[PDB]
Design a protein around this ligand. Structure first.
Ligand SMILES: [Ba+2]
Ligand SMILES: [Ba+2]
Ligand SMILES: [Ba+2]
Ligand SMILES: [Ba+2]
Length: 107
Protein backbone atom coordinates (compact mmCIF):
# COMPACT_ATOMS: atom_id res chain seq x y z
CA UNK A 1 0.00 0.00 0.00
CA UNK A 2 2.91 2.24 0.88
CA UNK A 3 4.60 1.21 -2.36
CA UNK A 4 1.70 2.39 -4.51
CA UNK A 5 1.41 5.69 -2.69
CA UNK A 6 5.17 6.33 -3.00
CA UNK A 7 5.07 5.59 -6.74
CA UNK A 8 2.16 7.97 -7.33
CA UNK A 9 3.87 10.63 -5.20
CA UNK A 10 7.09 10.34 -7.21
CA UNK A 11 5.18 10.99 -10.41
CA UNK A 12 3.49 14.07 -8.92
CA UNK A 13 6.62 15.47 -7.32
CA UNK A 14 9.18 14.90 -10.07
CA UNK A 15 6.96 16.37 -12.85
CA UNK A 16 5.51 19.87 -12.70
CA UNK A 17 2.54 18.75 -14.85
CA UNK A 18 1.35 15.26 -13.91
CA UNK A 19 -1.60 13.59 -15.65
CA UNK A 20 -3.02 10.17 -14.74
CA UNK A 21 -4.91 8.70 -17.68
CA UNK A 22 -6.20 5.42 -19.13
CA UNK A 23 -6.45 3.77 -22.53
CA UNK A 24 -8.79 5.26 -25.16
CA UNK A 25 -9.98 8.05 -22.84
CA UNK A 26 -11.40 11.04 -24.76
CA UNK A 27 -11.29 13.50 -21.86
CA UNK A 28 -7.75 12.35 -21.05
CA UNK A 29 -6.77 13.08 -24.65
CA UNK A 30 -8.50 16.46 -24.61
CA UNK A 31 -6.87 17.52 -21.35
CA UNK A 32 -3.41 16.43 -22.49
CA UNK A 33 -3.90 18.26 -25.80
CA UNK A 34 -4.90 21.46 -24.01
CA UNK A 35 -1.81 21.26 -21.81
CA UNK A 36 0.53 20.54 -24.73
CA UNK A 37 -1.00 23.57 -26.45
CA UNK A 38 0.72 25.67 -23.77
CA UNK A 39 4.01 24.04 -24.86
CA UNK A 40 4.29 22.20 -21.55
CA UNK A 41 5.58 18.93 -23.07
CA UNK A 42 9.02 19.26 -21.46
CA UNK A 43 7.53 19.39 -17.94
CA UNK A 44 4.78 16.91 -18.53
CA UNK A 45 4.32 13.31 -17.55
CA UNK A 46 1.32 11.17 -18.53
CA UNK A 47 0.86 7.86 -16.71
CA UNK A 48 -1.58 5.29 -18.08
CA UNK A 49 -2.86 3.70 -14.88
CA UNK A 50 -5.13 1.19 -16.63
CA UNK A 51 -2.03 -0.55 -17.98
CA UNK A 52 -0.94 -1.25 -14.45
CA UNK A 53 -1.60 -4.21 -12.11
CA UNK A 54 -2.55 -1.83 -9.30
CA UNK A 55 -5.07 0.42 -11.06
CA UNK A 56 -7.67 0.25 -8.28
CA UNK A 57 -5.09 1.12 -5.62
CA UNK A 58 -3.91 4.06 -7.71
CA UNK A 59 -7.47 5.31 -8.32
CA UNK A 60 -8.29 5.01 -4.63
CA UNK A 61 -5.20 7.05 -3.73
CA UNK A 62 -6.06 9.65 -6.39
CA UNK A 63 -9.49 9.91 -4.79
CA UNK A 64 -7.92 10.42 -1.36
CA UNK A 65 -5.80 13.21 -2.85
CA UNK A 66 -8.40 14.88 -5.11
CA UNK A 67 -11.94 13.72 -4.27
CA UNK A 68 -12.48 11.64 -7.43
CA UNK A 69 -11.21 8.26 -8.64
CA UNK A 70 -11.81 8.96 -12.34
CA UNK A 71 -9.22 9.81 -14.97
CA UNK A 72 -7.95 12.12 -16.12
CA UNK A 73 -6.52 13.37 -12.82
CA UNK A 74 -4.34 16.47 -13.20
CA UNK A 75 -1.76 18.00 -10.85
CA UNK A 76 0.26 21.17 -11.48
CA UNK A 77 3.23 21.71 -9.15
CA UNK A 78 1.57 19.24 -6.77
CA UNK A 79 -1.61 21.34 -6.66
CA UNK A 80 -4.82 19.57 -7.62
CA UNK A 81 -6.39 20.85 -10.81
CA UNK A 82 -8.77 17.93 -11.08
CA UNK A 83 -10.25 16.52 -14.26
CA UNK A 84 -10.60 17.76 -17.81
CA UNK A 85 -13.73 19.79 -16.96
CA UNK A 86 -11.84 21.52 -14.13
CA UNK A 87 -9.00 22.24 -16.58
CA UNK A 88 -11.43 23.69 -19.12
CA UNK A 89 -12.95 25.98 -16.50
CA UNK A 90 -9.49 27.16 -15.40
CA UNK A 91 -8.41 27.64 -19.01
CA UNK A 92 -11.48 29.62 -20.07
CA UNK A 93 -11.41 31.84 -16.96
CA UNK A 94 -7.72 32.67 -17.09
CA UNK A 95 -6.61 30.72 -14.05
CA UNK A 96 -4.60 28.12 -15.94
CA UNK A 97 -2.48 30.75 -17.64
CA UNK A 98 -2.07 32.48 -14.30
CA UNK A 99 -0.80 29.21 -12.78
CA UNK A 100 1.66 28.60 -15.59
CA UNK A 101 2.99 32.16 -15.52
CA UNK A 102 3.82 31.85 -11.82
CA UNK A 103 5.83 28.70 -12.63
CA UNK A 104 7.75 30.40 -15.43
CA UNK A 105 6.22 28.01 -17.97
CA UNK A 106 4.49 30.62 -20.10
CA UNK A 107 5.49 34.25 -20.54
BA1 LIG B 1 -12.52 1.31 -25.90
BA1 LIG C 1 7.86 15.00 -21.07
BA1 LIG D 1 -3.21 -7.19 -9.96
BA1 LIG E 1 -5.05 -6.34 -8.16
Amino acid sequence: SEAVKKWVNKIIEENIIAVFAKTECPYCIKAISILKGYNLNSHMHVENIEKNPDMANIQAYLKELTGKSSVPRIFINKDVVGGCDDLVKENDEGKLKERLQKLGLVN
